[PDB]
Amino acid sequence: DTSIDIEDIKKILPHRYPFLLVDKVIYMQPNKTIIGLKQVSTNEPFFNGHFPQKQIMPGVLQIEALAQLAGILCLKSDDSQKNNLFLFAGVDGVRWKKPVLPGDTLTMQANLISFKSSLGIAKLSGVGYVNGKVVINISEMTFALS
Amino acid sequence: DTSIDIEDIKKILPHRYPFLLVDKVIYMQPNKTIIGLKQVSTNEPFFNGHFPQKQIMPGVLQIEALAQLAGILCLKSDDSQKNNLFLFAGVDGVRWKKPVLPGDTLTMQANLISFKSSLGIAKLSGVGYVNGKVVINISEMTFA
Amino acid sequence: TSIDIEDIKKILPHRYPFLLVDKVIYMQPNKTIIGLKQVSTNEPFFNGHFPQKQIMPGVLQIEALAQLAGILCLKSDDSQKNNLFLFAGVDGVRWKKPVLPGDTLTMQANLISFKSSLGIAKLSGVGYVNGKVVINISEMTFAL
Amino acid sequence: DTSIDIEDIKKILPHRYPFLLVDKVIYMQPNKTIIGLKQVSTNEPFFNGHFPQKQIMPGVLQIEALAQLAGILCLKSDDSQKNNLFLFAGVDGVRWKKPVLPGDTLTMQANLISFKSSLGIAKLSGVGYVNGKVVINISEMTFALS
Amino acid sequence: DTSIDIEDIKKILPHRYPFLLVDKVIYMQPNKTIIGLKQVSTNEPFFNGHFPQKQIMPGVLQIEALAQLAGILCLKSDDSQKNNLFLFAGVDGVRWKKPVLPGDTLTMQANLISFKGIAKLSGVGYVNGKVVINISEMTFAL
Amino acid sequence: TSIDIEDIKKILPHRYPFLLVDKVIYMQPNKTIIGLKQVSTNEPFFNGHFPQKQIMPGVLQIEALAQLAGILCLKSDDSQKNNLFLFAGVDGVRWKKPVLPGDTLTMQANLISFKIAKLSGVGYVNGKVVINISEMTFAL
Ligand SMILES: Clc1ccc(OCc2ccccc2)c2ncccc12
Ligand SMILES: Clc1ccc(OCc2ccccc2)c2ncccc12
Ligand SMILES: Clc1ccc(OCc2ccccc2)c2ncccc12
Structure with a gap:
């Protein structure tokens, strides 16, 4: 399996x-x-x-x-911090290569870089695809546990 | 490259x-x-x-x-009848097989059965798929 | 009996x-x-x-x-304490007249069959605007 | 007794x-x-x-x-003033008697009192009904035309 | 005073x-x-x-x-009557002075006149310290 | 030169x-x-x-x-009479403070280069900085 449908997504995110x-x-x-x-x-x-x-x-x-x-x-x-309210702290190195249109499926991958869980500091990279081609590139996404 | 994207669909359907x-x-x-x-x-x-x-x-x-x-x-x-507001006249033989959920792609086929080049009215069959599996069956949609 | 929109929401999800x-x-x-x-x-x-x-x-x-x-x-019947019914099938739908802003849509459904805790219900349905027939449905089938 | 339907109303009102x-x-x-x-x-x-x-x-x-x-x-x-954007200027003596609920029909009557072709100063009374009973009563609506 | 922010507004109003x-x-x-x-x-x-x-x-x-x-x-x-569904009953003497537009900040003041639920209140709104709306009397009902 | 929003909709799509x-x-x-x-x-x-x-x-x-x-x-510059611009990239964004119901968001954008147009941008609530953007990139 290894899949998650929107009901379980809603249990994780607010x-x-x-x-x-x-x-x-x-x-x-x-x-x-x-x-x-x-x-x-x-x-x-x-x-x-x-x-x-x-x-x-x-x-x-x-x-x-x-x-x-x-x-x-x-x-x-990591859910030691039982708080699901994540806020955007900073974002860096965004380049958009191609319009995303009605009809497209947006296939997304995010990679975790650093986590210092004691603080609430998480850094990630991101890439978004349509038909296997790169539409959105993100160098660094910084999120805050508040 | 026979396909129609959102913009041109909006030129066809009202x-x-x-x-x-x-x-x-x-x-x-x-x-x-x-x-x-x-x-x-x-x-x-x-x-x-x-x-x-x-x-x-x-x-x-x-x-x-x-x-x-x-x-x-x-x-x-047939766009001799230069009017894009069709109305559903009836529908027959609808069975729903599986839930359609957020995350699915709904792939749909409609097949033209009859068009009245004398009376007036179109009859079509419909099938909808999610991951190749049948989710909706429609025997007859009637248009006028 | 009558049933208000508040009580309706107590029955339907x-x-x-x-x-x-x-x-x-x-x-x-x-x-x-x-x-x-x-x-x-x-x-x-x-x-x-x-x-x-x-x-x-x-x-x-x-x-x-x-x-x-x-x-x-x-x-x-509410022995099945499940209010989440789903449409299973619909058969013989015919639309006669457009329903418009200003209209009241008076609706009648007539229960045909109920197979208890199999959870199959079959019903007929008609709709009216000004005493005139606007929608006819031979058979609505549900998974209770 | 021309019944006026949604489309023609939209041709009068913005x-x-x-x-x-x-x-x-x-x-x-x-x-x-x-x-x-x-x-x-x-x-x-x-x-x-x-x-x-x-x-x-x-x-x-x-x-x-x-x-x-x-x-x-x-x-x-009177449409000599071909400006259909009318604004509320004052309202006086509004009483509510009964709750207006989903399923009701709100039957409404407005009566013209005064109208000066000079600025857009029109004064009107108004009553609303549900099942013949009074639900909203308004002594005076004042409307300014821009 | 001490402010009542949004979340706390939703705990008072329905x-x-x-x-x-x-x-x-x-x-x-x-x-x-x-x-x-x-x-x-x-x-x-x-x-x-x-x-x-x-x-x-x-x-x-x-x-x-x-x-x-x-x-x-x-x-x-007064929350002795712990029923937050208050309904409009009457409103009297409204006079709109000026268009309120996107970009504006609507600053508002309501003044309690009588309370017996029967409550009567006056109201005034401003944009840039200028009066946009006047309300002599708002009447409300439980 | 000051403005009301009816004109903003004549500029932006x-x-x-x-x-x-x-x-x-x-x-x-x-x-x-x-x-x-x-x-x-x-x-x-x-x-x-x-x-x-x-x-x-x-x-x-x-x-x-x-x-x-x-x-x-x-x-x-409206020699290029296309008002449909599109975001191409954005760089160096930091959020300092939550923007809430009740706030006014006062915004300033400063044009850097135009051939492809680059811009910086800052947002304030109460004269205090809430959002900082080093570089926004556009492709009309
Ligand atoms: Cl060709 C087309 C045009 C307009 C439509 O609107 C939905 C509808 C349903 C019933 C009566 C009139 C209109 C359609 N609804 C379903 C299917 C086709 C349709
Ligand atoms: Cl009893 C009931 C429960 C839920 C419903 O939602 C629409 C629907 C349609 C098809 C499959 C599942 C759900 C219903 N939709 C139409 C009619 C009855 C319904
Ligand atoms: Cl000029 C302009 C045009 C279009 C816009 O839409 C947002 C957007 C974002 C990313 C890719 C395409 C479009 C804009 N979004 C933000 C700022 C400017 C914009």
Whole structure:
């Protein structure tokens, strides 16, 4: 198996509609890496405003999606700190290569770099794909246990 | 490269948010068959109400998506009738086999049975798949 | 009996924007149920169906009847303390007239069969706007 | 006795979703009176917030509905001022008697009192009903045209 | 005073999205007065309908904001009646002076007149220290 | 030169629920831009971020500053009559303080290079720094 459907995602993360952007976790290795996806449908509430004339997934939400996927890893790698409210502290080295569109499946991988659990400091890298091609690159995502 | 993306789907169907349920058309043969997809995400407005404790894509929206996909075939097979507001006339032989969940891709095939080049009205069959498994069966969708 | 929207939510798990029964105006356990849905412009599906012309999607008329059908099943028999029913099949649906903002949709469902703790219920359904037939359904089948 | 339907109402009023609260106009007399209705359904977006435990139509939106209805009468009594963006200027003597609930029909009547072609100063009274019973009573609505 | 932030507002009022119209209470004196604010942003769900061509905060929603602020005062002034569902009963003498727009900060004050639940309150809203809305009398019901 | 939001929608193509600039208070073409976003509870994202605690998601603060940035670009040079710009990359973002219901978010974007347009961006609540962005990169 090694899979996780949205009901169990909701037990881990606090995020709800309209700001839960991880539909499924397909693979996870604690303290190491996590693979998951987000489905991109026209029937999402952000598309109307971005944009009326042309529907492109906001890249900033692509950041959020990966961050949430990254958040799951930390929470399942270490839950000694029984607090699932993770906040973005800093993000670095983001480059967007290709528009993500309604219809695409967004395949995401996040890799855990450093964890000093006593503080609440987690650093991660992230890559997002569509059809095996790189759409979003993230060098370093910094998250805070508050 | 025979396929239709969101923008051109919106040039064909009048449907908009939150009731446009075709993301992509991946194959189409005029007057014969159409294959498309709808991505199923937690970030869709119906899941909060269906249901709070357990997110299941309402089966009636699976009828809707397949029927919108069917509607594209009718309109691209014959646009002499320059009007894109078709209405569902009836539906028959719907069985739901498996839940459709956030994370799935809904792959849909609609097959044209009859088009009345005399009376007026289209009849089509529909099938929807998740990971190759059959989730929805529709014997006959009726259009006018 | 009558049943208010507060008591309806005590029976059905459906929440916004997918609860499509406003009131149940008559009920007879194991036999028949009469209810209503008020159709207003101020509903979230009307923007997307359609921008140029607001017609209540026929599939939601299926949804509403079947939600009203579900209430009858849960009140006729609740030994199965499960309110999460799912649509299993629907057969013989025919839409006669567009349902519009301003309309009251008066709905009747008639219980045909119930196989106890197998959890199979079969029901017929009709909808009306101004005494006129707008939706007919031969058979709604549920997995209790 | 032209029944007025959703589409033609939208041709009179600039209001759109989720702030158009007239579904139909069933009777109109230019410069005199107007009767219309608003259908009250659970499937409206304001009901989740007002209130989670008990759905009651916000009394203020009942004001807004009569205000839109009255606004239809003004625009169909006199459109020499081809500016359909009318704003609320004052409201006086509003009483609420009964809760307006999902499933109800809100039947609304507005009566024109005064109208000066000089600025957009139109004064109107208004009553709302559910099952013939009075639910909202308004002595005077004052509307300024921009 | 001491502020009542958002989370604590939701513990006093039963109102939720999209009908909670009080963002913050900056000062409150039980049985006397309450001062609060509502941030007016374009990213609010009513602005698309009011209006497509020109975004103006509906006037009746400013009544609702002040009526919710008033509501906080009543419920904290006396919670012997531990029923937070207070309903509008009457409103009298409303006069809107100026359009409230996206970008503005709506500063609001409600003043308790009488309490017997029967509570009467006056209300005033400001944008840039300028009066946008006046309310002589709000009447409310349990 | 001061501004109301009807004109902002004539510049930017973003609409509800993804227009995140309410007012432009100052703009010097090819140089700097000062704007604001009002943070209210009556905003659609707050229900999901989070149920128990309402905090403006940091990524949407990037979105606000970047929309403010894209206004400067479109007014500084509209020879390229395409108002659909797209984020290409963003670098050196640090979040110092939560943005909450009740706050005003005062934003400043400073144009660095234009051939591809680069910009820095800072966000304040009460004159105190909440968000810092070293480099935003755009591709119209
Ligand atoms: Cl000028 C401009 C155009 C379009 C935008 O949408 C967000 C976005 C983000 C990533 C990739 C494409 C688009 C913008 N988002 C933020 C800031 C500016 C923007
Ligand atoms: Cl009794 C009941 C329970 C739940 C429902 O949700 C819609 C649905 C449709 C298809 C499969 C599962 C669920 C219902 N939908 C329509 C009719 C009845 C229903
Ligand atoms: Cl071609 C097409 C056009 C419009 C539609 O709207 C849904 C609907 C359902 C019932 C009556 C009218 C309209 C469709 N609904 C389902 C399937 C196709 C459709």
